[PDB]
Structure formats: structure tokens, C-alpha cells
């Protein structure tokens, strides 16, 4: 999903 996106932020 691109809530999943979200998390490639923080990595």
C-alpha cells in the first residue's frame, strides 16, 4: 500500500 511508502521514509 503507500502507507507501506510511509515506512521507506524513516529507512
Known amino acids: 500500500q503507500p ?3 510511509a515506512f ?3 529507512m
Request: hydrophobic letters at 35%.
Open 3 to 5: 502507507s507501506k511508502d
Open 8 to 10: 521507506i521514509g524513516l
